[PDB]
Design a protein around this ligand. Structure first.
Ligand SMILES: [Br-]
Ligand SMILES: [Br-]
Ligand SMILES: [Br-]
Ligand SMILES: [Br-]
Ligand SMILES: [Br-]
Ligand SMILES: [Br-]
Ligand SMILES: [Br-]
Ligand SMILES: [Br-]
Ligand SMILES: [Cl-]
Ligand code: NA
Ligand SMILES: [Pt+2]
Ligand SMILES: [Pt+2]
Length: 129
């Protein structure tokens, strides 16, 4: 599924991501925009052999099991395929664990490089929240 901007903002708020660990909804929407362009099915292989999965491009090295990332952990205790659902619940549950890990949203390199420090409020501008 390819979410619309306000549609994703609504889903993210419903699942309690809005201001989770202090990160306003626009941060989460911005991270999703640049991680996956809002596409729940996005996958991208990393040169280390891990793969990133879903709307928030959660990595198999640490967070989910894809059965092909040797020596990896599955800290969210989920198949990475679960992170490709049109329903964002598994992605949100895992993101909450990731962002609580100690480095906040810096764990998302696209958020650090493209969202951090920016007017992230723009991402929810106009949305009925
Ligand atoms: Br957009
Ligand atoms: Br919910
Ligand atoms: Br915001
Ligand atoms: Br594996
Ligand atoms: Br959803
Ligand atoms: Br959730
Ligand atoms: Br933080
Ligand atoms: Br909305
Ligand atoms: Cl929930
Ligand atoms: Na893994
Ligand atoms: Pt939902
Ligand atoms: Pt939820």
């Amino acid at each position: 599924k390819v979410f619309g901007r306000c549609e994703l903002a609504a889903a993210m708020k419903r699942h309690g991501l809005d201001n989770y660990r202090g990160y306003s909804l626009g941060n989460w929407v911005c991270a999703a925009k640049f991680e996956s362009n809002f596409n729940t099915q996005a996958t991208n292989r990393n040169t280390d052999g891990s793969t990133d999965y879903g709307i928030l491009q959660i990595n198999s090295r640490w967070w989910c099991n894809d059965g092909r990332t040797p020596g990896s952990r599955n800290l969210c205790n989920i198949p990475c395929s679960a992170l490709l659902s049109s329903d964002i619940t598994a992605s949100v549950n895992c993101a909450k664990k990731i962002v609580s890990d100690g480095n906040g949203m810096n764990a998302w390199v696209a958020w650090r490089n493209r969202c951090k420090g920016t007017d992230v409020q723009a991402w929810i501008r106009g949305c009925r929240l």
